[PDB]
Design an enzyme around this catalytic site. Structure first.
Site, mmCIF file in Angstrom:
data_model
loop_
_atom_site.group_PDB
_atom_site.id
_atom_site.type_symbol
_atom_site.label_atom_id
_atom_site.label_comp_id
_atom_site.label_asym_id
_atom_site.label_seq_id
_atom_site.Cartn_x
_atom_site.Cartn_y
_atom_site.Cartn_z
ATOM 1 N N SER A 68 25.309 -3.883 37.822
ATOM 2 C CA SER A 68 24.101 -3.430 37.126
ATOM 3 C C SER A 68 24.463 -2.526 35.945
ATOM 4 O O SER A 68 25.297 -1.622 36.087
ATOM 5 C CB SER A 68 23.165 -2.707 38.092
ATOM 6 O OG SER A 68 21.903 -2.538 37.505
ATOM 7 N N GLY A 69 23.909 -2.849 34.778
ATOM 8 C CA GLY A 69 24.129 -2.098 33.545
ATOM 9 C C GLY A 69 25.401 -2.422 32.754
ATOM 10 O O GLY A 69 25.751 -1.714 31.815
ATOM 11 N N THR A 116 22.460 -8.788 29.870
ATOM 12 C CA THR A 116 21.252 -9.048 29.069
ATOM 13 C C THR A 116 21.492 -8.891 27.545
ATOM 14 O O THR A 116 21.014 -9.697 26.754
ATOM 15 C CB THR A 116 20.081 -8.132 29.548
ATOM 16 O OG1 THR A 116 19.599 -8.565 30.832
ATOM 17 C CG2 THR A 116 18.856 -8.273 28.666
ATOM 18 N N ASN A 149 20.423 1.579 35.212
ATOM 19 C CA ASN A 149 20.165 1.019 33.906
ATOM 20 C C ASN A 149 18.745 1.387 33.450
ATOM 21 O O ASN A 149 17.773 1.044 34.134
ATOM 22 C CB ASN A 149 20.345 -0.507 33.996
ATOM 23 C CG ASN A 149 20.148 -1.206 32.675
ATOM 24 O OD1 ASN A 149 19.952 -0.568 31.631
ATOM 25 N ND2 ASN A 149 20.240 -2.540 32.698
ATOM 26 N N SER A 165 16.770 -2.084 33.151
ATOM 27 C CA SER A 165 17.226 -3.024 34.178
ATOM 28 C C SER A 165 16.309 -4.258 34.277
ATOM 29 O O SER A 165 15.108 -4.132 34.442
ATOM 30 C CB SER A 165 17.300 -2.349 35.525
ATOM 31 O OG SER A 165 17.845 -3.217 36.494
ATOM 32 N N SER A 166 16.906 -5.443 34.167
ATOM 33 C CA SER A 166 16.227 -6.700 34.495
ATOM 34 C C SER A 166 15.936 -6.762 36.007
ATOM 35 O O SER A 166 16.837 -6.694 36.836
ATOM 36 C CB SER A 166 17.082 -7.932 34.092
ATOM 37 O OG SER A 166 17.623 -7.849 32.791
ATOM 38 N N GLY A 181 22.219 -7.842 38.169
ATOM 39 C CA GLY A 181 23.567 -7.447 38.522
ATOM 40 C C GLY A 181 23.737 -6.765 39.877
ATOM 41 O O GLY A 181 22.836 -6.124 40.391
ATOM 42 N N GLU A 200 24.077 -4.308 42.679
ATOM 43 C CA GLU A 200 23.576 -2.939 42.748
ATOM 44 C C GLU A 200 23.572 -2.319 44.135
ATOM 45 O O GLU A 200 23.289 -2.975 45.133
ATOM 46 C CB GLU A 200 22.167 -2.832 42.157
ATOM 47 C CG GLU A 200 21.078 -3.709 42.777
ATOM 48 C CD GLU A 200 19.687 -3.468 42.128
ATOM 49 O OE1 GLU A 200 19.597 -3.272 40.887
ATOM 50 O OE2 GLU A 200 18.672 -3.461 42.856
HETATM 51 N N1 ADP Z 1 27.116 -4.845 23.269
HETATM 52 C C1 ADP Z 1 26.269 -3.736 23.387
HETATM 53 N N2 ADP Z 1 25.958 -2.988 22.318
HETATM 54 C C2 ADP Z 1 25.158 -1.896 22.385
HETATM 55 N N3 ADP Z 1 24.613 -1.534 23.556
HETATM 56 C C3 ADP Z 1 24.907 -2.262 24.652
HETATM 57 C C4 ADP Z 1 25.700 -3.366 24.578
HETATM 58 N N4 ADP Z 1 25.841 -3.967 25.815
HETATM 59 C C5 ADP Z 1 25.126 -3.150 26.769
HETATM 60 N N5 ADP Z 1 24.394 -2.152 25.945
HETATM 61 C C6 ADP Z 1 23.917 -0.874 26.496
HETATM 62 O O1 ADP Z 1 23.882 -0.845 27.929
HETATM 63 C C7 ADP Z 1 22.533 -0.997 28.425
HETATM 64 C C8 ADP Z 1 22.421 -1.900 29.645
HETATM 65 O O2 ADP Z 1 22.914 -3.210 29.385
HETATM 66 P P1 ADP Z 1 22.203 -4.519 30.006
HETATM 67 O O3 ADP Z 1 22.743 -5.754 29.165
HETATM 68 O O4 ADP Z 1 20.635 -4.231 29.949
HETATM 69 O O5 ADP Z 1 22.617 -4.610 31.586
HETATM 70 P P2 ADP Z 1 22.575 -5.807 32.686
HETATM 71 O O6 ADP Z 1 24.096 -6.198 32.751
HETATM 72 O O7 ADP Z 1 22.031 -4.980 33.909
HETATM 73 O O8 ADP Z 1 21.480 -6.681 31.968
HETATM 74 C C9 ADP Z 1 21.746 -1.552 27.246
HETATM 75 O O9 ADP Z 1 20.365 -1.271 27.379
HETATM 76 C C10 ADP Z 1 22.436 -0.835 26.095
HETATM 77 O O10 ADP Z 1 21.916 0.469 26.062
HETATM 78 F F1 ALF Z 2 20.367 -3.909 35.334
HETATM 79 AL AL1 ALF Z 2 20.924 -5.607 35.265
HETATM 80 F F2 ALF Z 2 21.555 -7.273 35.320
HETATM 81 F F3 ALF Z 2 22.041 -5.281 36.607
HETATM 82 F F4 ALF Z 2 19.701 -6.042 34.052
HETATM 83 MG MG MG Z 3 19.677 -7.207 32.496
#
Ligand code: ADP
Ligand code: ALF
Ligand code: MG
Length: 728
Positions: A181-182, A186, A227, A230-231, A451, A453
């Site tokens: 997670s995080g 996404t 996160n 979080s999705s 993800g 968690e």
């Molecule tokens: N490549 C990136 N560039 C800038 N911020 C990022 C990037 N990847 C992750 N983020 C930061 O980390 C946070 C969580 O990532 P996310 O893709 O939402 O998690 P998950 O793997 O749970 O979907 C984002 O909201 C952003 O703040």
């Molecule tokens: F917070 Al996630 F995939 F784990 F959006």
């Molecule tokens: Mg996500």
């Protein structure tokens, strides 16, 4: 000037390793040798660099940081790579492949904001937790049509390789983005979509594909402790292409949304973003027409102690959500209907049941009930009766119940969760009708699951998420190691089997097995047993698995928890409410009430059978668990028909902070993801092979015939990485 050769370009500035200086050159041509060692043998993931000062036939002696000399056997030593390798773009090139060496290379890159690195055949992405300017249109154009080894590591590059493999092989592809997670799944998904929409685009469709995301994130994402965004649902995005290779549409499949969050959130978390967006960004006239106020006035928004997220303006996001709904094509009446439902949910949450004369509940103040009924367009006397005095059959007799306070409140919650969940499915259906308009020739499927968690309290929601993550890890294990080695055997290339020691099957079977029954199967059986309770359920689980299955633990410190050892670690699950969550009940009298709604959207949520109806399994409705296992099995069958490409997202720490790599946090992910193992099979193996006959017609065994870079199999010729790509 070509940006890739121009050292002044933003491509060089943000995607390439920075030029070393004269002092670094000196250190780089040193004849000295170094080793990674642990100052404290109890902390296996904290490493320092020591100089090798002498050796025997079977040992190295080295100096420590503090001074003193230590000895170590040559076979146990983790040698440090020559520093000319620090920052290398593909780690399959390292001379020494060991844990601190791989971590060190990722660290050097991360320290200069180089978040993408290859590990043989797959990409590793380390979350920066800050903005880096590497996703502009100008960056898109640079990667367009370039082969992996001609350009720097990037999410765009792996997206282009999938696109070209789809054109040259005429077969469907998938982009599988893993991570706890995080970790960044996404954000990386969004970039894959951006890239494909540009390189294969012609318009309006491509904008609509992109604007689908803000709508779904508004209703489907929330702040958790892991996160801020979080999705809380999983998604598989099918980008569809015609025979010529242009984007012809898209289709979104969602996976089980966390409905429970609508009515309950843990300390510091938030409900879904959309509730805060509406209350902050509504016009003064909308606020009066919906009887709104601020977040603190609503039970469903005032229990966590958190109503906002640092760096986020909910009023600005509401404007973005609305602009997305326009571009996608939701009418103005539909939009108002959507927000009427959001507003009604909030009002329903404010209903306060109290004990009456006897045990049955009453409602003294009707203000919240009346405001909900007004916006939903239902009759408040009917609703009230349906909540506290729902009718059921007892045999064939029709008997009016009178629910107590606890049961009345729980039934109101079930209504709310059904309203929100059905609305989410309706939004996805409406989006799909717009984005999908032609039969596809091919597709690239992009997978963004929720993800892995762990929280203080882990319930049925977390078991479903974590099982999904385990299934995805096993798919990686299967394609990288298992299917690969099976091909070498069938073809007798004098390949020696290696046990890479990565196998999630035992855990998967413990969860979803049918004979003997797994956890989900025993939950289903208890769910249709009229005398079952959460205590009979946990007793049944302990009886079948305790001291019998190596991946299960009956804890000595609790009577309501059980532990599962996942690839990413052990998780303790609390059993409270699992029967009710698996059955997902809703009083029929509540459904009858909302079927008579004057609102055109509310009526579809309760009359459309694809949204409102539930499949039967003999004499009972199908369980949440059985439905989910089936949806996931169907996803996996689809993935097995594609050529998969893997992106492993890695979180740097557990605080959502930039510029802070935490040794133990990163190394735990590299181990359980199987990154090093993935590098080793890439080096020792034969990724490329083609039937001798098809080889002669393009580029039989005599005809086809450096000796090392190939081997002759029973029906194919096998090339190592370096040769087969360099002869076309
Ligand atoms: N490549 C990136 N560039 C800038 N911020 C990022 C990037 N990847 C992750 N983020 C930061 O980390 C946070 C969580 O990532 P996310 O893709 O939402 O998690 P998950 O793997 O749970 O979907 C984002 O909201 C952003 O703040
Ligand atoms: F917070 Al996630 F995939 F784990 F959006
Ligand atoms: Mg996500």
């Amino acid at each position: 000037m070509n940006p890739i050769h121009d050292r002044t370009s933003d491509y060089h500035k943000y995607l390439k390793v920075k030029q070393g200086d004269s002092d670094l050159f000196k250190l780089t041509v040193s004849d000295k040798r170094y080793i990674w060692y642990n100052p404290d043998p109890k902390e296996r993931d904290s490493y320092e660099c020591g100089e090798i000062v002498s050796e025997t036939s079977d040992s190295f002696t080295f100096k420590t940081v503090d001074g003193q000399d230590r000895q170590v056997k040559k076979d146990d030593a983790n040698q440090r790579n020559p520093i000319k390798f620090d920052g290398v773009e593909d780690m399959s090139e390292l001379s020494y492949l060991n844990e601190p060496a791989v971590f060190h290379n990722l660290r050097v890159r991360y320290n200069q904001d180089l978040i993408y690195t290859y590990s043989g055949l797959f990409l590793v992405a380390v979350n920066p937790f800050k903005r880096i300017p590497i996703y502009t249109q100008e960056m898109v154009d640079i990667f367009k049509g370039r082969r992996r080894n001609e350009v720097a590591p990037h999410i765009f590059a792996i997206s282009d390789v999938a696109y070209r493999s789809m054109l040259d092989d005429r077969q469907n592809q998938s982009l599988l983005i893993t991570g706890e997670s995080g970790a960044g799944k996404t954000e990386n998904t969004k970039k894959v979509i951006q890239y494909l929409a540009s390189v294969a685009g012609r318009g309006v469709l491509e904008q609509q594909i992109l604007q689908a995301n803000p709508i779904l994130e508004a209703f489907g994402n929330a702040k958790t402790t892991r996160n801020n965004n979080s999705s809380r649902f999983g998604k598989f995005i099918e980008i569809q292409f015609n025979s010529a290779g242009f984007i012809s549409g898209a289709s979104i499949q969602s996976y089980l949304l966390e409905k429970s969050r609508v009515v309950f959130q843990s300390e510091t978390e938030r409900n879904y973003h959309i509730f805060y967006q509406l209350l902050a960004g509504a016009t003064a006239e909308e606020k009066k027409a919906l009887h709104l106020a601020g977040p603190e006035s609503f039970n469903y928004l005032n229990q966590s102690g958190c109503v906002d997220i640092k760096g986020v303006s909910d009023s600005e996001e509401f404007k973005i959500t609305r602009q997305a709904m326009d571009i996608v094509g939701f009418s103005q009446e539909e939009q108002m209907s959507i927000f009427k439902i959001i507003a009604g949910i909030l009002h329903l949450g404010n209903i306060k049941f109290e004990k009456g004369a006897g045990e049955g509940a009453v409602l003294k103040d009707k203000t919240a009930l009346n405001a909900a009924s007004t916006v939903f367009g239902v009759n408040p006397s009917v609703l009230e009766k349906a909540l506290m005095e729902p009718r059921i059959l007892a045999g064939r007799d029709l008997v009016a119940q009178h629910l107590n306070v606890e049961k009345s409140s729980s039934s109101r919650d079930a209504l709310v969760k059904a309203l929100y969940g059905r609305l989410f499915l309706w939004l996805v259906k409406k989006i799909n009708n717009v984005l999908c308009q032609e039969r596809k020739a091919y597709f690239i499927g992009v997978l963004d699951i929720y993800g892995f968690e762990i929280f203080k309290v882990n319930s049925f929601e977390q078991l479903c998420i974590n099982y999904t993550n385990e299934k995805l890890q096993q798919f990686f294990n299967h394609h990288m190691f298992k299917l690969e080695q099976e091909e070498y055997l069938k073809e007798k290339i004098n390949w020696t089997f290696i046990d890479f020691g990565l196998d999630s099957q035992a855990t998967i079977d413990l969860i979803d097995g049918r004979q003997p029954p797994g956890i989900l199967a025993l939950l289903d059986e208890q769910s249709v047993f009229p005398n079952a309770t959460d205590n009979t359920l946990i007793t049944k689980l302990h009886s079948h698995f305790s001291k019998k299955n190596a991946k299960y633990e009956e804890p000595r410190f609790s009577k309501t928890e059980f532990g599962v050892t996942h690839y990413a670690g052990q998780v303790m699950y609390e059993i409270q409410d699992w029967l009710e969550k698996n059955k997902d009940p809703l009083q029929q009298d509540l459904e009858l009430c909302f079927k008579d709604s004057s609102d055109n959207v509310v009526t579809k949520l309760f009359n459309d059978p694809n949204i409102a109806s539930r499949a039967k399994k003999g004499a009972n409705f199908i369980t949440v668990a059985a439905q989910y296992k089936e949806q996931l099995a169907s996803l996996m069958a689809t993935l097995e028909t594609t050529n998969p490409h893997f992106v492993r997202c890695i979180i740097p720490n557990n605080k959502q902070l930039p510029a802070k790599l935490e040794d133990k946090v990163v190394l735990d992910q590299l181990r359980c993801n199987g990154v090093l193992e993935g590098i080793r099979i890439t080096r020792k193996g034969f990724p490329n092979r083609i039937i001798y006959a098809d080889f002669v017609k393009r580029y039989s065994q005599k005809a086809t015939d450096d000796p090392e870079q190939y081997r002759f199999g029973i029906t194919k010729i096998f090339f190592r990485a370096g040769q087969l790509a360099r002869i076309e």
